[PDB]
Amino acid sequence: TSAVSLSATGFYKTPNLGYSFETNSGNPFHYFSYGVACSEVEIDCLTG
Amino acid sequence: ADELVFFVNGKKVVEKNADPETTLLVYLRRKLGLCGTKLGCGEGGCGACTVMISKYDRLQNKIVHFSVNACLAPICSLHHVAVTTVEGIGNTQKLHPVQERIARSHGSQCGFCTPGIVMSMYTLLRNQPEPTVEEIENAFQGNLCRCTGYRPILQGFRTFAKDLSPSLFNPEDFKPLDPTQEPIFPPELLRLKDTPQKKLRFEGERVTWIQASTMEELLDLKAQHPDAKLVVGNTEIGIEMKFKNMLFPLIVCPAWIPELNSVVHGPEGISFGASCPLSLVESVLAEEIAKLPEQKTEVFRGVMEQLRWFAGKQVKSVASIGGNIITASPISDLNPVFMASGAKLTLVSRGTRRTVRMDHTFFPGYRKTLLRPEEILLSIEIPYSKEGEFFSAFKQASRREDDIAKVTSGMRVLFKPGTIEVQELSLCFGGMADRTISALKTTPKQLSKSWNEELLQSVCAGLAEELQLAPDAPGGMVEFRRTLTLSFFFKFYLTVLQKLGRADLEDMCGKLDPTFASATLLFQKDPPANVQLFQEVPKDQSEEDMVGRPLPHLAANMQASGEAVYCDDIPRYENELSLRLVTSTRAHAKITSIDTSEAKKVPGFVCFLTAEDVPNSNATGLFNDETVFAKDEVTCVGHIIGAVVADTPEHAQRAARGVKITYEDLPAIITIQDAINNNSFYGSEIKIEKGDLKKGFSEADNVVSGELYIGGQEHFYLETNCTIAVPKGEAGEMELFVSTQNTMKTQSFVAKMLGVPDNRIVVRVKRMGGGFGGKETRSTVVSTALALAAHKTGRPVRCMLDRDEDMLITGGRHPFLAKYKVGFMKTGTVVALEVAHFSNGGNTEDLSRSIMERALFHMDNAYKIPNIRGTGRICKTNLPSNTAFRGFGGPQGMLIAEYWMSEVAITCGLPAEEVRRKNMYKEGDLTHFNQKLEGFTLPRCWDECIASSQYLARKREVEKFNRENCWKKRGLCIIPTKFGISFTLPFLNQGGALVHVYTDGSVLLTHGGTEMGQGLHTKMVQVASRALKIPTSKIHISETSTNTVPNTSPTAASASADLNGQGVYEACQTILKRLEPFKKKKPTGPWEAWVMDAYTSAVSLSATGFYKTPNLGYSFETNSGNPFHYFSYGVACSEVEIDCLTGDHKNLRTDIVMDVGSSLNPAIDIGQVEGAFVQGLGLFTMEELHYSPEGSLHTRGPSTYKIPAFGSIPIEFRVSLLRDCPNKRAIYASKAVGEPPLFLASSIFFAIKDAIRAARAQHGDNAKQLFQLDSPATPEKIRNACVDQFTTL
Amino acid sequence: YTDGSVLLTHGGTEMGQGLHTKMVQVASRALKIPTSKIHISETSTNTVP
Amino acid sequence: ASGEAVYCDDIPRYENELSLRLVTSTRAHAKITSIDTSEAKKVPGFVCF
């Protein structure tokens, strides 16, 4: 009722990327994800 | 189990189970999906459903073409016929010349009436490739348009005929017509012209329809079941079935039978078969009148004169002569002619045949004839006139009830040969009782009498006695009716003197006074002129910059082709339901019980919704004082009690009739006086008060007091209220498609009724087939109900009101009563003014207080008044709630101002234009609400208009006509206007936009405004195009939605171009700053390259925009602060000619000079001046709502509510936009345009009053100077104020 | 909207990975209102290009 | 879990809605020598290929 706008767009671009195959430089990624898994199995050697 | 077989647009249609009740309009829209053809009224008045029919005539061996209203043509009448709709003649890929020309010349605004207008003009061209101008106008008698003011349509189509500033369109560029390129007449139908016609039987849900092929089958069937209802054109049966709930389970249609269609030239007259359409009757009588001698054609010309102003081409093509006779309406225009002239009617039944001369016995009771149940009317013989036999026909200038109280008349006289002495005299009238009647007591007294003054006065006293009307005879207007019986006879009397004189005998009869001759002339409208003037853009302006150029409405082509989608044109979901509202039949009553038992037996019935079914809140309306569905209490005839949901609208309608309500009456408050008596108001008195009232009244040389009543107005948007709610089944989400100006309130009323957050509801508007303020708030009573229904069923639900429902439920412009007292000098200078205003608000507050506020801000109109008091009260009453109507309080206040001003001039004995001009404000003056008037253009508009209308010279010609004419008079007025621009609620002066640019460079722009015919979207594209510096062709607007732009104000107060133009402009500026670096780096490289570089640099190509009108906010406490951002200005001078004997009149000429700043778009702005002007003209002169004493609106369609037609507009109509008047306060220096011109139609009202004054001075006797002319100045009101020897006794 | 309810939309689409849930989570932290006041209804080219 | 979540094919069909089915190659690499549509046209409700 004071005529202020209640709508907005927002926007974002990941900064500082651009890898060169020609020079093998620049960052392809913004960060890396990591993790590790231990798995155990039992096989049946006669049936697969 | 006969198949029904016809063609639509060349394609064969086979219907194996045709239902007799299915109209062509429903079949097209719903079975074939061809939605170009529209529903505007369903009673034949509006023409929006007009299509063409072609068939092979066997009575002519030629292919014929005529137009019909789809809304009244049963598909069962259509076997072996070929239909063409708007989709069949062209589309946007290849427009038909007719479609191109209406579009390019700006004759399509909202677009809703455009296809029916196209089909009328198209049909005309198929029958007359080289029509005359008179023919082009006539083709549209049955076609109504509410937006255009008609001028552009006629102007556009005039290019088919006669076989400073730039222009609005270029006819040089119209594609030529090639008739060889029309669709072929379906070759299949010319083969089937060989097999003789076989009887057909169709069986529907309730009706059986027998299409009889021979007289024998017909009379046979009437012998065995006399109940079988004859249907020929359906132009009356269709009304009885759709509006008066009559059902006729057996119908026979005889239209194929040759003997019912024959035309036979004989000795006494010409016999027409009963099924002959009035269009043929017209055509052969025209041919006969033209080729035979005057003396043989008197009756013929009488018939023709009644056919002149009798429905359009669409109706006459199918309305039978027999049908009119047998319907036996008390207001038939034909039956008095047939009676007076003693036409020979032949009647047959199985084994019988008799002949009767039509006389008083032919009509025994209300809507009855002397036909035996088993008889049919075979034929009617229209007689030649004998030597010394004279005939006239007459009809009441208007129509206010369905069936009664419209005077219409046939008059015949035969002379003893070689004499002036009366052998036969027959005077027959309709609208004076419940049947066509003869003046049988009166006429025999005149036998042998010489045709002279004693005859005249003896016939007048006779008719006054023999046709006396009781003060409460049905249909009212008794004074006016009595006078017309007398006046119509007087015209016949003078006409007869004139005609006696032509046969040499002017020595026996007495010569006619040359000032009387004008009384007898048959209605003639001279050729229309028309000029439009506007400003060219600067020579330097890029040709891609369309701002200030006459660019056509973006959707005009699509509207002219029937491709533009309106709400009910949207395809139905498979599982979609229909809804019909159920409304109170009492003004004020407790509901004691509701019984739905009969509704439940209707097939496809789903449920009946009531207050109990609302999830959260039954409290809605702008001020929260209205119910979704009535609870315990109904408060007006039209109060919504509930809603039937069913599969189809037909089933919803029958099921709704099966809801029985029982009432116990409560004390009702109906009129403004009723509510004054009862202290029944919406809140407290509103007041503006400046200077010193006792001091000004003391100073004053003269003081005048009086009252004025101003009647309301129905918007009559050609598209009625319509909503589709589509439930999404998750989280309460719903999406609605609505014909509304207010998406925000729709959204928020839907959410509150459901108790879900606004964020779940989306409201989408593509366009409305007109709004005018009627869809500012009132559309929501349809929306909420629909939305409820869809929530309960989890199915889509739709409702579109029929005309009757819409006119009844949604309310109108506020009626106003004023009581004024004005004090002034002998010089004309007014010094003191007191006006207390009253409005009728009806049963909810809605916008009523804001409307009164507006009236009060305009009670000055154009004039400085140093000592002034205005008060406003809005009455609360048991009527439908009245609402916004283009003008919004303005035209009512301003008309009151001009009415006391008219009395100022007359009292001072001075010229109105001088008294006006010297009271006018000047630059920098403060209004009564203390707002300073900057950029005051009104004196320029005034001076340009006095000059271009040639007003002072025209005043002299008016004087001259008046001294030389006794029974017609002319009048001339020039009227100014000031109209404040901005919503009276300050915070509503905001708007927003959202723009996207896609990677191909195209732009998708949306804003909070809605398109209702005013070309808003067009202007906004023009704006964005200038602001982005790219062509309009790269920018698109597809719709308005709450989920693209939120919290928008309604499209209203003429401000939407102002508000959204800024919003759009800001969003474009934001896009332009983000593009700048790509522009600099690549300064010539096209727009698309900048957009793609921005995209692949990850720059955002989406933006909002927003704007608020600065510096606003008036307080009534202090009388300070600006309510308006700026003011619109304009002046209209208008000339009329009134017929003092009937009260009819011609609008001779109107000149408008309008200040629209530097127009954004002169074509649309001229468009808006004319359209608004012509609605004004309706308000003040034509449009009248009539209510029962119990508060039940009775005028619920075009048949009794008369908006301006093609033929009502000023013969010469000039509009100029003011040059060099840029408005720094608004977008690209333009001004709002939508509402300011409506009140300038005032000038016609005051011209009429000027001519009445002249009539009153002519026919005395003494007094009253300062007589009453209330608005609208209908023929009734005009005739009654022309006091003469006929009104007195 | 004027009832205080928020309609939110963004260019990502929901394929079972709980994205709108996360975006409703973010928006509620950013605005400092509960998640019940914020709705995401769909992804569309005519709201985010 | 309740089956009220709307996926694309759950959306109600319009009464005039048509259905489409793709026709695909049965050869890994080939010239199209002809397409004969005669049988397709005999199927009730066929509109076009």
Ligand SMILES: Cc1cc2nc3c(=O)[nH]c(=O)nc-3n(C[C@H](O)[C@H](O)[C@H](O)COP(=O)(O)OP(=O)(O)OC[C@H]3O[C@@H](n4cnc5c(N)ncnc54)[C@H](O)[C@@H]3O)c2cc1C
């Ligand atoms: C927009 C509009 C404007 C109109 N304006 C006027 C006007 O200004 N003045 C005026 O006088 N009328 C007016 N009418 C009425 C019009 O003249 C009649 O509706 C028409 O002539 C009836 O003919 P129909 O073939 O359409 O009759 P239908 O509606 O088909 O039938 C009307 C009645 O006539 C009966 N009937 C038809 N033929 C025979 C037969 N041969 N034998 C026995 N009964 C028969 C039917 O049983 C039925 O009761 C208007 C109608 C419309 C829709």
Ligand SMILES: O=c1[nH]c(=O)c2[nH]c(=O)[nH]c2[nH]1
């Ligand atoms: O000042 C106005 N407020 C409104 O809400 C409105 N609606 C309208 O049609 N004209 C106006 N004028």
Ligand code: FES
């Ligand atoms: S819709 Fe048929 S005449 Fe108005």
Ligand code: FES
């Ligand atoms: S354009 Fe003719 S009714 Fe609106």
Ligand SMILES: [Ca+2]
């Ligand atoms: Ca209305």
Ligand SMILES: [Ca+2]
């Ligand atoms: Ca009201």
